[PDB]
Design an enzyme around this catalytic site. Structure first.
Site, PDB file in Angstrom:
ATOM      1  N   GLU A 357      40.680  41.051  50.612  1.00  0.00           N
ATOM      2  CA  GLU A 357      39.601  40.287  51.229  1.00  0.00           C
ATOM      3  C   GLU A 357      38.834  41.116  52.251  1.00  0.00           C
ATOM      4  OE1 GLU A 357      38.802  37.556  49.978  1.00  0.00           O
ATOM      5  OE2 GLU A 357      40.582  36.647  49.081  1.00  0.00           O
ATOM      6  N   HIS A 487      38.954  28.128  33.519  1.00  0.00           N
ATOM      7  CA  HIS A 487      37.642  28.760  33.413  1.00  0.00           C
ATOM      8  C   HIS A 487      36.806  28.149  32.296  1.00  0.00           C
ATOM      9  CE1 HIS A 487      39.533  31.873  35.949  1.00  0.00           C
ATOM     10  NE2 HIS A 487      38.293  32.178  36.289  1.00  0.00           N
TER      11      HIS A 487
END
Ligand SMILES: *[C@@H]1O[C@H](CO)[C@@H](O)[C@H](O)[C@H]1NC(C)=O
Ligand SMILES: *[C@@H]1O[C@H](CO)[C@@H](O)[C@H](O)[C@H]1NC(C)=O
Ligand SMILES: *[C@@H]1O[C@H](CO)[C@@H](O)[C@H](O)[C@H]1NC(C)=O
Ligand SMILES: *[C@@H]1O[C@H](CO)[C@@H](O)[C@H](O)[C@H]1NC(C)=O
Ligand SMILES: *[C@@H]1O[C@H](CO)[C@@H](O)[C@H](O)[C@H]1NC(C)=O
Lengths: 594, 201
Positions: A357, A487
């Site tokens: 991150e 997805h």
């Protein structure tokens, strides 16, 4: 003048207004994520409506300037991005039908529940109960029962619904002069106007399948090795020559291979590295973790990150007074505002995700100088790779030795390399073929060139002949098994994973070869190399103003995807497997029938 | 000199509400207290950029006629105030000649301008004719015709409103916080010359 100055001034005004409105909406979204209230949901709806209306009005306004007589490139790119209205071409009836059908997707997935008959009143959802009953058990009867039951009532509900979805998507593609919605997805890799850097929407399938054909033997050998381990472990159920059924892969739908690690390790007596004991014995916390992370990043060469982050961050969960999601994310806010939201826990994977991150935030901070429209990566694959470079680099034992966590008593030999490479291979080469399979399937089903009434039979055959996995029980034509993924239900691009996996290894090779850190590929440390950081930044600054091929050229020197870095990373493990598993049966038989 | 004949020229460095950038406030100084070493000793003021003459030897030369200037800008464009750079503000809002002799002062206003709802009371000109003359002020909001075409100042398309609005907030990072800026200039010897301060022989 001509329309060039008109476009320039219009783009300036749009940049200003879009910047302001985007900042408003994103700050509201952050405030909701920090603290959840119904009034915050109302604010979310209001901000979304304002953003949608502004985008619609601005796109309709921009549709006036034609693209024929524009000689610049950045202006042409911005106008091409903005002029595409999107779903406005469809009538309101089918527009709201699409909105409702996506709502049905979200409801049937997020609120979709299969409940255990033992406790019908209080049972487990899709997570985490299904995962812990599918990947934390040995008995095969309940495993196959759950495998059949998950799609016994979920696939039935969506097949006509998915047919309506796909026909409406075909109408969507027809409205915008696209052959198929797959072309709409592939359009992110399309660049024109530059000689020698031209990329069409066709070559992607060919070069991706060529790369998969190159990588096939290693995956075949690893699959044979895992099958041999299974036969030597539990042969009482699986035929010694038959293929590997999917329900033995741990994951409910067969995506990863990491959870098989309990029955794969060859070096059982050898202990794997674990810094958690020293992490807790030295009183480590999130603040120190991010401090050392930014120290590593400034060691590489990239500048230290903003000070306004520190007094505007939420790293440690403030007790249980307020309830909020702590799923790790990196938020870009604009106007010099970047944030990280994660709940810190003491585990190595949390260390790696913190590095990931932080790298994401670095990439977001890179292209702040670019205009608002061009504030994005070259494509949908650069972000994940440029974030995972540091995650891959910081997991080396040399880095742990340098930082001072691991005691220098650890010796470095071939055994630890074999264990580490086995773990990384199980992470990577077990998910590359699955990603390629799913993307190819969605590609030729959205092209509409295939028939309808034996989709399941063809799909199972072409899975068996490629990935070498056989179904446990026959499936009829009413099933819609490939829709179980998150997805595929919510219209997400799935090809970014293949691109990320190739690109991260390309980056690693091209940034360690220039780093002059001689040795094995996996023992490469990016830290204390300013030239590598500069070489990274000379492309990481562009954003998306230039074609992705030009971007990949500036750091690697190659103009496309290449498997060679990936084969170089697994060279020691490939040699080990070839030298040791020669006596074991390799490949999957084409005559096996369940 | 005496000098307890004070004049209110130190209020521009400590005020309550600064003006916009298009209406930059111009002031004249004469027969005043010429104390300037105190200004250099003020820690909160941060950007002290002089281009015309020597900063430490700014008090050496007597200031016959003094002009003070005040306005507020965005964080990035404090670098654009320096002479010799083109773009926004420097060419559409306010101009500084290359031969200009003087100094510029800038400081932060994070806690004196922020608002949780967003401050929209500061405007700036975004469009203009060919150029604004050096040291000149433009206030009129005539509808900017854009390029060509019969758009006779109506609305909506092609034609654009020249004066856009700023937005300032507490959560902004460095590079978007408001910066308060003042300018000091002088000119020589016309009408019996008035003021200069601490010529401590
Ligand atoms: C979060 O929201 C709850 C309920 O609205 C409120 O009681 C609490 O004070 C809020 N906390 C913060 C930090 O805003
Ligand atoms: C496109 O416009 C930008 C505007 O700043 C300019 O810098 C660039 O040189 C232009 N390029 C071409 C090819 O016209
Ligand atoms: C700037 O980088 C250094 C490391 O080179 C770091 O110690 C320092 O904390 C950074 N600045 C801020 C404000 O964090
Ligand atoms: C990087 O340089 C720092 C600076 O002294 C040093 O402490 C650290 O051990 C070095 N690490 C590597 C891997 O060279
Ligand atoms: C305004 O603030 C500055 C801050 O340094 C201070 O020096 C000055 O004396 C203040 N003005 C008045 C009139 O006190």
């Amino acid at each position: 003048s001509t329309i060039e100055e008109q476009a320039k001034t219009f783009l300036d005004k749009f940049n200003h207004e879009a910047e302001d409105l985007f900042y408003q909406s994103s700050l509201a979204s952050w405030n909701y994520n920090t603290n959840i209230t119904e009034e915050n949901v109302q604010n979310m709806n209001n901000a979304g409506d304002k953003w949608s209306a502004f985008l619609k009005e601005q796109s309709t306004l921009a549709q006036m300037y034609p693209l024929q007589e524009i000689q610049n490139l950045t202006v042409k790119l911005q106008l091409q991005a903005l002029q595409q209205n999107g779903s406005s071409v469809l009538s309101e009836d089918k527009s709201k039908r699409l909105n409702t059908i996506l709502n049905t997707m979200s409801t049937i997935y997020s609120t979709g529940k299969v409940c255990n008959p033992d406790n019908p009143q209080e049972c487990l959802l899709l997570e985490p109960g299904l995962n812990e009953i599918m990947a934390n058990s040995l008995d095969y009867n309940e495993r196959l029962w759950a495998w059949e039951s998950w799609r016994s009532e979920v696939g039935k509900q969506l097949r006509p619904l998915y047919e309506e979805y796909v026909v409406l998507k075909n109408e969507m593609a027809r409205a915008n002069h696209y052959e198929d919605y797959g072309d709409y997805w592939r359009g992110d890799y399309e660049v024109n106007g530059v000689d020698g850097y031209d990329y069409s929407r066709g070559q992607l399938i060919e070069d991706v399948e060529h790369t998969f054909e190159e990588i096939k033997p290693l995956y075949e050998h690893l699959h044979a090795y895992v099958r041999a381990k299974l036969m030597n472990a539990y042969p009482s159920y699986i035929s010694p020559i038959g293929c590997l059924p999917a329900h033995l892969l741990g994951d409910m739908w067969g995506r990863f291979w990491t959870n098989l690690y309990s029955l794969t390790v060859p070096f059982g007596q050898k202990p794997n590295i674990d810094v958690t004991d020293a992490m807790v014995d030295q009183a480590w916390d999130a603040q120190r973790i991010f401090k050392e992370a930014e120290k590593f990043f400034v060691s590489v060469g990239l500048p230290n990150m903003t000070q306004g982050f520190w007094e505007n961050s939420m790293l440690t969960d403030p007790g249980n007074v307020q309830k909020a999601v702590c799923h790790p994310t990196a938020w870009d806010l604009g106007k010099g505002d970047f944030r990280i939201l994660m709940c810190t826990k003491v585990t190595m994977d949390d260390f790696l995700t913190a590095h990931h991150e932080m790298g994401h935030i670095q990439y977001d901070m890179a292209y702040a100088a670019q205009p608002f429209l061009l504030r994005n990566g070259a494509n949908e694959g650069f972000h994940e790779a440029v974030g995972e470079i540091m995650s891959l680099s910081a997991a080396t034992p040399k880095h742990l030795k340098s930082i001072g966590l691991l005691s220098p008593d650890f010796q470095e030999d071939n055994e630890t390399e074999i264990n580490f490479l086995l773990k990384q291979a199980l992470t990577i080469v077990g998910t590359l073929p699955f990603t390629y399979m799913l993307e190819k399937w969605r590609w030729m089903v959205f092209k509409g060139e295939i028939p309808k009434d034996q989709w399941m039979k063809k799909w199972w055959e072409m899975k068996r002949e490629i990935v070498g996995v056989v179904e446990p029980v026959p499936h009829d034509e009413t099933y819609c098994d490939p829709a179980s993924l998150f997805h595929v239900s919510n219209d997400y691009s799935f090809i970014r994973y293949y691109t990320r996996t190739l690109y991260q290894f390309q980056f690693q090779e091209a940034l360690c070869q220039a780093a002059k850190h001689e040795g094995p590929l996996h023992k490469c440390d990016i830290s204390n190399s300013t030239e590598a950081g500069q070489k990274l930044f000379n492309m990481l600054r562009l954003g998306k103003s230039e074609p992705w091929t030009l971007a990949l050229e500036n750091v690697v020197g190659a103009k496309n995807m290449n498997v060679r870095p990936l084969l170089n990373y697994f060279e020691p493990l490939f040699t080990w497997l070839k030298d040791q598993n020669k006596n074991s049966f390799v490949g999957w038989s084409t005559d096996w029938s369940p | 000199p005496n000098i307890t004949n004070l004049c209110p020229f130190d209020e521009v460095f400590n005020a309550t509400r600064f003006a916009s950038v298009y209406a930059w406030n111009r002031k004249r100084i004469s027969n005043c207290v010429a104390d300037y070493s105190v200004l250099y000793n003020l820690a909160p003021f941060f950007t002290f950029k002089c281009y015309g003459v020597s900063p430490t030897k700014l008090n050496d030369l007597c200031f016959t006629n003094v002009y003070a200037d005040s306005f507020v800008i965005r964080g990035d464009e404090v670098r654009q105030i320096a002479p010799g750079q083109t773009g926004n503000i420097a060419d559409y809002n306010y101009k500084l000649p290359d031969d200009f002799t003087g100094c510029v002062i800038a400081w932060n206003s994070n806690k004196l301008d922020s608002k949780v709802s967003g401050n929209y009371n500061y405007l700036y000109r975004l469009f203009r004719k060919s150029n604004l003359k050096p040291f000149e002020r433009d206030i009129s909001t005539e509808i900017y015709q854009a390029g060509n075409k019969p758009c006779n100042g109506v609305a909506g398309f092609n034609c654009y409103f020249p004066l856009r609005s700023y937005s300032f907030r507490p959560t902004y990072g460095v590079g978007h916080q408001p910066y308060r800026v003042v300018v000091l200039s002088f000119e020589l010897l016309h009408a019996p010359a008035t003021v200069c301060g601490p010529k401590k022989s």
